[PDB]
Amino acid sequence: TYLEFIQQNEERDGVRFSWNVWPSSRLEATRMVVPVAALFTPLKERPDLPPIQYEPVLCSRTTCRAVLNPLCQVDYRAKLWACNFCYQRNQFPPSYAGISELNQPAELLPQFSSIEYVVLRGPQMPLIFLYVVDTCMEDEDLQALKESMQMSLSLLPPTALVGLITFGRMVQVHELGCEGISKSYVFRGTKDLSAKQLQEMLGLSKVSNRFLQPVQKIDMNLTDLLGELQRDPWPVPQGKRPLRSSGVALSIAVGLLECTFPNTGARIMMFIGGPATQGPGMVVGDELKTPIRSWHDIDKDNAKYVKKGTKHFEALANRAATTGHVIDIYACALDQTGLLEMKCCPNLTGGYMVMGDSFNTSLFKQTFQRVFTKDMHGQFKMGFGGTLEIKTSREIKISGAIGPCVSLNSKGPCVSENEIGTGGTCQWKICGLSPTTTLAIYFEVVGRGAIQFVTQYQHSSGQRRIRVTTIARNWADAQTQIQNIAASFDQEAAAILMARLAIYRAETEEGPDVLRWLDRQLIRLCQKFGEYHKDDPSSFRFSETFSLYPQFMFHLRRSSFLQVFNNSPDESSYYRHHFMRQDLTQSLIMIQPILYAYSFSGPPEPVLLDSSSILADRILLMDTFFQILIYHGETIAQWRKSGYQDMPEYENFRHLLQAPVDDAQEILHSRFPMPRYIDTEHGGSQARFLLSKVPILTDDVSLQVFMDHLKKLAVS
């Protein structure tokens, strides 16, 4: 089976290609209509895998430098190996003396296609966590944020270095380890600074300091300082927003780590409580008369702070990315905080972007401590300073990448002229990655081909490691094996990989032409892979390998990702942030939410996202990745409002309500961005959240009529 092939190659190598059988000619690949692409998860969890602990063996040719992998032919008696990418002959290091046909090294065995090596690089650097805390909030939210920050401080390893920057009307850089006194350097919340300027102003040499000190050393002092942290003393007049200098403080946090510990893993964790009202990076005017930018205000050229504001945080992002540090944003407020401007910081570094209502919520407190999830051994599940190197066969060139990465502009033979998204390179830098981080790599064409993925990072224990995943897929003569290629079509992967592109274009200079293009490719796909007599719409039939694809496009073009005029700019930047990050399983849930049905007649069963699944005697459980919604039918709502549940006769009914709630509590612990929960029913005010999730090709239209304008156009 090919469904078995996709699931086994995903759990093993952490990859999912749009096509698992590739055309050998450049022309027919162009007409394939879905470029040869793949979701790649570099650090996909592999409990089974054991780190090797020895340096990898690389091909001696300079421009290749590929890692020893099972695809290389080996002459054991001659003690040589031929690199399957450039056909170069290479010898084995002297430690590989006893290699044999029956006692071969691990990296040559097919099962260990993807493996991790332990690098003997030499510097075991400690981790670095810098807190940048907003003080322009109420005592309730601050007292809880103080409670949460001490909780994270208790989990950090003893050797890690911590720092604290508090900002209000002015920015403060506290000196830890102050004895019998507390001193803090202060800066204007209106002037930007460079890394060299702050290096000289704080009194520091080039390349433990007084601001970043070990956890085992300053735990008493810091947990006392976080407890004594009160809010911004500067009062706020009427009709005015507090003078909050978010952009200035983040710039100092970037420059501080830029001149003390550059080129090493670190996390800049900035917690904000509202929008930036004092530039640079200004989001909105200080007066409360001027409202926050709206997707309408920003489309009528009525947001005089967006262009200059996003530009500021865009420069801070490339500064932190090049230096090798991670910028996290934990924004909790009752209105927008500037995530549309500040999106670039946790999007280029592999940082997190957490949006919520306030810090005193069980929503945030839970989400924040999931960031510090340890493995079984007791080490964090974070990875820093990632360098992703991809090599391909000479018949294959890389277009580009989409996702949390920064180009290194490493030109080479595996770099295609026509680049897509983050392209013009075969090397990318991912500052912060997790086992969930997933990139989209797009390829091109000009016996089986090969692609090797090399990833070097710093493990949270400090150890330096390299992850290599090598995969190979069979070539094909499309003039003879169209059936062999269409059998390798990954409709799930191709749906996300195409959605990945359509959203990146929405960031891009392009307008609503994405809708016009997303349908043109769907028409092109159905035209080529559909069995039909032309001009007969009913004659059109899908192959099962392609059945769900037109349904995936329907829910994509109608989703919140492309129709942003129903959410706020900070919300749209939040949804798109997590979609470019998740693997396949979660990305599908995002586009097409899951739905469950609970009834007396039968166990829980998934059902279609149409109104035909909404019944009076059935409880529904919707699962868009961002929120959980339990919906009670009209008949069950009446039985619920009467009080049958307490009555010991209806033991069956009290359990019928508990079945979806228990399964809802499950998903409120595993999912890293804990979703918003909704307990609504037939006729509730929050029932709008379910009914909304249930020339151009078509306007807003049901699924069936979307298939008809697809059929009659595919046959013309």
Add this chain to the structure above:
Amino acid sequence: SPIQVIENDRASRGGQVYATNTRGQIPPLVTTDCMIQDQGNASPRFIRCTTYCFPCTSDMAKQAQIPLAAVIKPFATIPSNESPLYLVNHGESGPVRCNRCKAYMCPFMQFIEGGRRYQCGFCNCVNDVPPFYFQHLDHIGRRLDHYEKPELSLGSYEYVATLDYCRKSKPPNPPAFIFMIDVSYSNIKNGLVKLICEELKTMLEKIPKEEQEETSAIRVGFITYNKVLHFFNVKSNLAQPQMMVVTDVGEVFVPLLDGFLVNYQESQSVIHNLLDQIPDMFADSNENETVFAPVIQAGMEALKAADCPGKLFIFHSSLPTAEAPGKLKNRDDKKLVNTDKEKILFQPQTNVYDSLAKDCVAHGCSVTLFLFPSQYVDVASLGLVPQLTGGTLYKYNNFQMHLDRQQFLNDLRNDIEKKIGFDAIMRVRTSTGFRATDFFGGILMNNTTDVEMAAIDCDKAVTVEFKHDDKLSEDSGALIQCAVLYTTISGQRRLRIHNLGLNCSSQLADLYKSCETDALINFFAKSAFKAVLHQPLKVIREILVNQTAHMLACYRKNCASPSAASQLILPDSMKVLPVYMNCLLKNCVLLSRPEISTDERAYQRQLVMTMGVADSQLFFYPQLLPIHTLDVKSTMLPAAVRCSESRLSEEGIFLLANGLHMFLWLGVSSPPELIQGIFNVPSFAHINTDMTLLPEVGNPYSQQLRMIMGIIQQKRPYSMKLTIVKQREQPEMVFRQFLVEDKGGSSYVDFLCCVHKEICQLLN
């Protein structure tokens, strides 16, 4: 000699009461201690004049070339036995003023038409008196309550100022004391930093408060600096002071409100917790470069945040060299004699110190700098802000702990407890016939008319110059009214008025009869010292000599009884005008390069500018007391002797003091008896000049010499640096610089014959 005059006036006027009832009366000399009673005109302790009888025609003023000036010490310390000033309140209407010249109500306004209306002496305009103040008459132009109300019979009193006098028409806030300390290596090593902190705890208790209140309303803030400013949070509720360090020097800002300027009694335990740590805090500091102007810029902005005046107590070590606004280079350069641009050596290097001074005065900010130089420091630049602001500059050359410790702590106790006002403006109004045209003192001005003083104490003094306008009247004379609007240490707007009348005369004889030589020198000294910043020194010195000669030539030529062509005829008032004038011309400020540091030149130039007449008389003609002759168990005052090396014996011991230094001179044949009863060591060769600290051992003489040293220091604001000197080949080369009647410029008999050769040039 000057001594023969001082004692001749002490004998005729000492121990007697001088009542200022006469219009153009001539008060005693400053040296002459006498009880004063305020009838009519103001006391000479407040205001003395060059001449108490002005010429009536401007052409006559050009003839005698006698300067018409006055030296006002508006807040002089009234003695305990002299009646204090009375506070006057005229209700909501505010103090009664003339509607033309805006002169305040004073005894010079005669009531007429039944007291219904009054005519101002200054302009003669008539104002219908407000009814509430009206309804009082006397048989002959005397308010019935004329005697009861002080604004009608006294010449010195105070008014209550309404809201339309205050800033923004709102009642002012009490001032604040901001103590700012240099903490570079220079002051850590010589042990000055912990000294300031330890002794501050004691004298923070003694911050001035009024009798009507129970605790001083002056709040207190704290800052340390070394090229980087250190603010301190000392709110009442903190068990541990917070530090906020500012490095954005250049665009300096105050990062704190409410952690600053707290009532000392409220945050007592918190401040003392800070004063114990600051010495330990910067002990291992190796920083040597420091800032200066950003420290004043910071203390000024802190006073603007709390919206209140204040006084900055700055303690500084050496030259500020760190890259910042106000950075001073070493600009000492061969540029003084006939340089025609020597005036640059007495001016601030950058142009910002004037602008920083303007910003301070506008917001009522004063700075008193305590300078501890060990090298060149550029007093001309550092002291410009603490001088334009009405503060003081305390300079201690090459500070050493075992010596100048007592001298500095005595000056710090003094400048804290000074009866000081804040955000003050002075306005000298005159009658129809003249007006104030020039001003001298620690002050700043924008309007020709108004003098602005950020802070003024009992020791400051302003010298005002008058120029003729139209013609004076012999019947009315010439009237002066000085008004000083300010803010009290309890935060209350208050006026102080000084009224002084003088008589005009159409006769040149009455002009010279009514001259005070002590006051003439005070104006001439300041006059030259201000023109130093504009004209070459040899030019100014020619102006001084020619004007002195032209004065003594017009007395001789115009009305002097016919005398011989070899004699110099000078009146009784100007007996010693040539001697004093020759001493001012020998002060280092107007002299050449060799052996005189420019910083000492800039230091002495600033000191005189703020001098009261009493002081100006001592700094220029020091007091020389012989000690050996003094007989024990005798009246304490020993008569002064003329200031020359001639009146000295090898055997003899003398005391010299000009108000800033005090020298204990010892002859080579000094009797070992007195040396044992004072210095505790047997012989003359057993004294160590370098150990010039206060010696206490002794019973007849060491208590007698220490008694006469105390009475000399009494009326003097600066505590004098004692300097013990032996006779032959010792550091007495500095001691001879104060024996001003010695050559060292021309001599006395030469300057007299110099005055006479131009006495005959003005043929008559």
